[PDB]
Ligand binder design. Structure first.
Ligand SMILES: *C(=N)[C@@H]1C[C@H]2C[C@H](NC2=O)C(=O)NCC(C)(C)[C@H](NC(=O)OCc2ccccc2)C(=O)N2C[C@H]3[C@@H]([C@H]2C(=O)N1)C3(C)C
Ligand SMILES: *C(=N)[C@@H]1C[C@H]2C[C@H](NC2=O)C(=O)NCC(C)(C)[C@H](NC(=O)OCc2ccccc2)C(=O)N2C[C@H]3[C@@H]([C@H]2C(=O)N1)C3(C)C
Lengths: 305, 305
């Protein structure tokens, strides 16, 4: 037993990380087959970043201006192109460590692992959620851009995130691997602000199911509710509305525990209205919303890759 | 910015994981050079585990009784021996993926990454502390034993933990890689209990320094204290006594922030006596003690491997 915020094993992604330098700017790239994907702001001077014209800036860049290094060894760049907010650098060598992979654009409320990198070298791994407001709560410094987020389904790596920037509240914005931002963010150093940080209601319920599976049971009550009744409470606390689709996704955890989703909603309602009275659930003194139903089942059943 | 519970990249360890079966029992092993290390209770029937005589049980086991599988391929066992609570299986092939490695017995209050495995296959990665009471708060199911804990110093993997068992409170006990338990635990299914779960005081202070570095500053106060004065408060709250050695280890974080360790102790004292008044620090509503000073510096400076 026990329940931890748990990342995917990072080895398959570590083998894809490279360093990309253009002029004096160095960040990370992802090497898959004969392509290196990296944030297009590698071509910018610090000054360019205030108001960049990326197409105009790219005119001045040739293949040889892109220095790509895989550990200690230089890759030869034989082509380049911009797709949305990412550059694709064609190199003369297919990455021999390329795993089975897909590009996916994840939905808000889904989780993924981040392999934080600097100079093409991995620093660490942690789990994040795509928040309803299309930000993530990461850990990123100067040089981290091009660090990616991913999921693994047995042998297949689904890349869903590439790191580009930080907003106030120290939250993080970036793109899918087609270079399209999550949310309304742009890759320019100008005032941008995150919207309301809504709580992922279905994830809080999944985590309450994890707590029950682990014998943390004190918050189970004698009450039930309805979707509409619960949602009137959700709304006051900036929780996402719960739908029948959410109830259906919680079906495995409801079946394993014998607790109806609406009974668990009645427990959640009491926790939102009364707080936790200085008690903990799975060692937390707040309600956790960065575990998906699938994360709880994966962790509680010991699914491997 | 941002501050996350962050594991080491797991790739170097993933390449060392194998499956070990003896009779009907399957667990994980660690393959380094031509040796596979695994928990000795692989040789036990469920019934044996109530009161095992490991030397007597091992008489009945030969090299061929140890089925070792590295992904899909069988390793040939050419020798076996018991060292404390681990078996060492000599195989006819040196692991071609062996990293630069050391075995270290960590001190209580130090952190490490766990690569949770089942059937020799990685499930996930998370960060743990060796708690003062010589347990860890992990996430382990049936089949997880032989999962290891480690640190990386640039290219060198320091293995410090091998998973053996679960105690009440759903906490975890195991050995160093010489097969010596942390704490007084034995590898027998008989009533054993964890001692008092003391808080790692130096780690809480390190995390308060991380919060300041991140602009979470509300808890800084107008007060200072002394070691002896602070420690009279520590003791009531089951905090480890703070020593000058702890103060010296916090020197980098004190110097970076300009906040004297004793001033931060005065802030900690107010938080212990008054609580957090429903406020958060780095998104937590409790004081976090599983980041070491070195973890905070590593994360806040972007150290790579
Ligand atoms: C990638 N290597 C880098 C990522 C990190 C820099 C650091 N945290 C990161 O995630 C950080 O301090 N980032 C904040 C700054 C100001 C540097 C901007 N953010 C930004 O401009 O957001 C809009 C804003 C502007 C002014 C005030 C408030 C909000 C930032 O992250 N970046 C500016 C520049 C690149 C990016 C960056 O440094 N990425 C791009 C957006 C092109
Ligand atoms: C390794 N494959 C396995 C690890 C896991 C089993 C699971 N969690 C684990 O970490 C679990 O439920 N473990 C608890 C049980 C009861 C199975 C024992 N713990 C134990 O005996 O602790 C002492 C105790 C006895 C009775 C009541 C209270 C405490 C346990 O973990 N194991 C029994 C047997 C191996 C180990 C195990 O299953 N490891 C060994 C200790 C030889």
């Amino acid at each position: 037993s026990g329940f931890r915020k748990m990342a995917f094993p990072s080895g398959k992604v570590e083998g894809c990380m490279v360093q990309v330098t253009c002029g004096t700017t160095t960040l990370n790239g992802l090497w898959l087959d004969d392509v290196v994907y990296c944030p297009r702001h590698v071509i910018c001077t610090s000054e360019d970043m205030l108001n960049p014209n990326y197409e105009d800036l790219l005119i001045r860049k040739s293949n040889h201006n892109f220095l790509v290094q895989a550990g200690n060894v230089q890759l030869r760049v034989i082509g380049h192109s911009m797709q949305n907010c990412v550059l694709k650098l064609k190199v003369d060598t297919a990455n021999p460590k390329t795993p089975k992979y897909k590009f996916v654009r994840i939905q808000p409320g889904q989780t993924f692992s981040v392999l934080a990198c600097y100079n093409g070298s991995p620093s660490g791994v942690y789990q994040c959620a795509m928040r309803p407001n299309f930000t993530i709560k990461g850990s990123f410094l100067n040089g981290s851009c091009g660090s990616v987020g991913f999921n693994i389904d047995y042998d297949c790596v689904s890349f869903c995130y590439m790191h580009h920037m930080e907003l106030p509240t120290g939250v993080h914005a970036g793109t899918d691997l087609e270079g399209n931002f999550y949310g309304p963010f742009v890759d320019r150093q100008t005032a941008q602000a995150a919207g309301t940080d809504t709580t992922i209601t279905v994830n809080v319920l999944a985590w309450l199911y994890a707590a029950v599976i682990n014998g943390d049971r004190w918050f189970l009550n004698r009450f039930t509710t309805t979707l509409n009744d619960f949602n009137l409470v959700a709304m006051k606390y900036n929780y996402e509305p719960l739908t029948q689709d959410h109830v259906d996704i919680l079906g495995p955890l409801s079946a394993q525990t014998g607790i109806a989703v609406l009974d668990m909603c009645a427990s959640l309602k009491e926790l939102l209205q009364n707080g936790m009275n200085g008690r903990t659930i799975l060692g937390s003194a707040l309600l956790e919303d960065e575990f998906t139903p699938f994360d709880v089942v994966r962790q509680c059943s010991g699914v491997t890759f």
